[PDB]
């Protein structure tokens, strides 16, 4: 079994899309990714892969801090903005959400403080507690098979 | 910041919707899960997260093994089957892909040997590395805001 069935299988896995956000003196950092789940409920952690080729590796290793972007069905152009799929880059609207920076209008903004480092293969896992949330209910961007997709309605 | 709060924002993330399987002693063992995730490509890495209340949890640190079986947009009842949702089990069609009981017909078959457990609140997070994958071309069933759903066709 080769690296395309691999891979293949993965996407047969349906997501949503975020864009993970940190801050590191000043500067906001964003990247996008799927690879993101709820973990605990007491305490109330989450967690988040980062690929070790990953700018945003260091950036979550120095802040020890991170934002989940949980995106909107309206928001594809953001998830190419922040998965670097675009030639031309993005002007983004950030707001603030215990003290980090979140995009405005996500379906869903989630806070977090790094607990937790996990190397695992070709990525890291950052385990994060959740210190701020805000959701609203617009309806969900989807991954699945290599697409963006939506739910039926 | 409720427990209320904290589970509505998680189900903002949409997903699929797995059974994990695995073999004890003759006994095949399943449940249903969401909280998946592809880790890593070299070596060949995915994850599920087992809540500590659930019998699965001794059942995969004692068998050392799972398969995720990937459920397809026509297995929402075996979804509710294997998340304890019935008052009497199906009798489930299984079939074997690399030592692994897995469910027939699933969209698709992922079967893993634990490589590392690590314990992350409420959960313990199973990395298991893929040893075999079977793919096929159908539509997932998806899990958002705490209703099952399907993709726009
Ligand atoms: C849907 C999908 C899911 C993905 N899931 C994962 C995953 O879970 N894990 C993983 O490691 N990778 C994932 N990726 C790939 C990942 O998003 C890209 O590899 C990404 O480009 C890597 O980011 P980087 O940290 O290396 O920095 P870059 O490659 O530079 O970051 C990507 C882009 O973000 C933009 N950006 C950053 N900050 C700002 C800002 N302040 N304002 C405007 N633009 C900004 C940059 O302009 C750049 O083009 C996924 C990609 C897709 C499309
Ligand atoms: C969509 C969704 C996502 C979920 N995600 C997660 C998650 O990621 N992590 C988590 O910990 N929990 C998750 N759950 C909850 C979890 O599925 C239930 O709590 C489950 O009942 C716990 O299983 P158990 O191991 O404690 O054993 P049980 O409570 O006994 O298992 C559940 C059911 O599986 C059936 N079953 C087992 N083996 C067979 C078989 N051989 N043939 C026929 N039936 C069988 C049993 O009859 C039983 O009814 C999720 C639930 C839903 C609905």
């Given at each position: 079994m080769?690296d395309?069935?691999?891979?293949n299988?993965?996407?047969?896995f349906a997501?949503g899309?975020?864009?993970?956000?940190?801050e590191?003196?000043?500067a906001?950092h964003?990247?996008?990714?799927?690879?993101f789940?709820?973990?605990?409920?007491?305490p109330?952690?989450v967690?988040?892969s980062?690929?070790?080729?990953?700018?945003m590796?260091?950036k979550?290793?120095?802040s020890?801090?991170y934002?989940?972007?949980?995106?909107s069905?309206?928001?594809?152009v953001?998830?190419?903005?922040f998965?670097?799929?675009?030639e031309?880059?993005?002007?983004?609207?950030?707001?603030?959400?215990?003290?980090?920076?979140?995009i405005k209008d996500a379906?869903?903004?989630?806070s977090?403080q790094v607990?937790?480092?996990?190397?695992?293969?070709?990525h890291?896992l950052?385990?994060?507690?959740?210190?701020?949330?805000?959701?609203?209910?617009?309806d969900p961007?989807?991954?699945?098979s290599?697409?963006?997709?939506?739910?039926?309605?």
């Amino acid at each position: 079994m080769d690296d395309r069935l691999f891979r293949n299988a993965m996407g047969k896995f349906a997501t949503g899309v975020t864009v993970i956000t940190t801050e590191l003196n000043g500067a906001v950092h964003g990247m996008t990714a799927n690879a993101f789940m709820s973990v605990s409920l007491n305490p109330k952690l989450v967690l988040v892969s980062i690929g070790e080729k990953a700018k945003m590796l260091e950036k979550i290793q120095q802040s020890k801090k991170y934002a989940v972007n949980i995106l909107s069905q309206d928001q594809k152009v953001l998830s190419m903005n922040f998965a670097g799929q675009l030639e031309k880059p993005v002007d983004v609207q950030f707001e603030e959400l215990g003290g980090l920076p979140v995009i405005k209008d996500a379906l869903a903004q989630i806070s977090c403080q790094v607990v937790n480092e996990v190397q695992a293969g070709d990525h890291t896992l950052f385990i994060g507690e959740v210190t701020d949330i805000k959701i609203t209910e617009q309806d969900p961007l989807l991954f699945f098979s290599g697409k963006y997709h939506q739910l039926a309605q």
